UniProtKB/Swiss-Prot annotation, chains A, B, C, D:
Protein family: Belongs to the transthyretin family. 5-hydroxyisourate hydrolase subfamily.
Source species of the chain: Danio rerio (Zebrafish)
Misc note: HIU hydrolysis also occurs spontaneously, but more slowly.
Compartment(s) of residence: Peroxisome
Catalysed conversion reaction: 5-hydroxyisourate + H2O = 5-hydroxy-2-oxo-4-ureido-2,5-dihydro-1H-imidazole-5-carboxylate + H(+)
Protein name: 5-hydroxyisourate hydrolase
Lineage: Eukaryota, Metazoa, Chordata, Craniata, Vertebrata
Pathway(s) it belongs to: Purine metabolism; urate degradation; (S)-allantoin from urate: step 2/3
Gene behind this protein: urah
Record EC number: 3.5.2.17
Functional summary from the UniProt entry: Catalyzes the hydrolysis of 5-hydroxyisourate (HIU) to 2-oxo-4-hydroxy-4-carboxy-5-ureidoimidazoline (OHCU).
Positions spanned in the full protein: 26 to 138 of 138
GO BP terms in the entry: purine nucleobase metabolic process; urate catabolic process
A cellular component annotation (GO) from this entry: peroxisome
Subunit (UniProt): Homotetramer.
Length: 113, 113, 113, 113
């Protein structure tokens, strides 16, 4: 709304709760990143209100998931210290859902609406 | 050996050929990434000779897949301009396989050996 | 409610619309599968009304997805003529989400709720 | 050769060893399945000798992975008592690799070679 996520712990068949997510946007002129917001997934593994419609401008975004910290808080290690999903937003009339299905040794993502 | 990849175009059920892959390593001390190697996947979607045993030391690595340029060359667009998989190497006795299963609107990876 | 699905065409980045889905349940003792409900996905790739809470008993269920016919209607072939996901329900106090993430040459599913 | 598989336990990031696999092929006049071969994956998670080149005719095949029995022999429960992958072979000149990425609550499959 207009950007949502869902973190899923597919090793346990439950949502990934309390994972830190940091949203960034690429600066159009330099190659650098602006932090837009930092969230934490709720018990349903979601992060409501990541961005407002007015600030969700077209461009290139990056969602960093703190997978290493998540798994560590469950007392286990992860192959990935963090996961960054980088994606292009051009059509701003649509909803964009960028989930993360995660184990300690795998991850997947897809574009949802 | 000891780091390998495999790009799979799961939209067409064929390997991802001619995709640029760049391997980086995080430098202990400075919080900077530095390029170790660049490669281009062959027809089987693999990139032999990414790194030698002597240089495959423990640390944090990142493999950047140019998914945007790959799909642009197939005359299609990608949700992801590029994919970076960041991973921790501590046990240097093992072989690490870091594949990319890719469509225009999704991707996934797992730790293989 | 209490069983749902979600079909996502990850090759095209859109919900899987108008896919026929059939829920079956295995009759304990006999080896007999029989139809519980036949449905079709709506515009958002979802299929409400799969089973009533009253009829949601512990047992083995199977959701059959007509992927071949789905792709055929899109003018493309599928590697899988249909997909059956078989699962065991023992805890009838929960909601079970059984999505299907589909391309022409791949699929995945996970337990959600 | 010409049909192969690879089972990966992505929950633990090791190969799916000692899993029972059953290959069937659909009888093209009745709508019923003929058992071709039953095998067990090796320590690498693979299962060589699934079918001979001679017996590899065009048709509909089905690979049943006994996931529930895999997990139980490991002291764990699986949401799926088994996984069957049904696929159409039309081009008999190609090799078909159909691996299974598995956890207790998720699985995915894709065409390779």
């Amino acid at each position: 709304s207009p950007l949502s996520t869902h973190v899923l712990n597919i090793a346990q068949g439950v949502p990934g709760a309390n994972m830190t997510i940091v949203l960034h946007r690429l600066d159009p002129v330099s190659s650098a990143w602006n932090i837009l917001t930092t969230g934490i997934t709720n018990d349903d593994g979601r992060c409501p209100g990541l961005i407002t419609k007015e600030n969700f401008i077209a461009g290139v975004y990056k969602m960093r998931f703190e997978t290493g910290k998540y798994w560590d808080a469950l007392g286990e290690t992860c192959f990935y210290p963090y996961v960054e999903i980088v994606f292009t937003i051009t059509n701003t009339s649509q909803h964009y859902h960028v989930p993360l299905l995660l184990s300690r040794f795998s991850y997947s993502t897809y574009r949802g609406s």
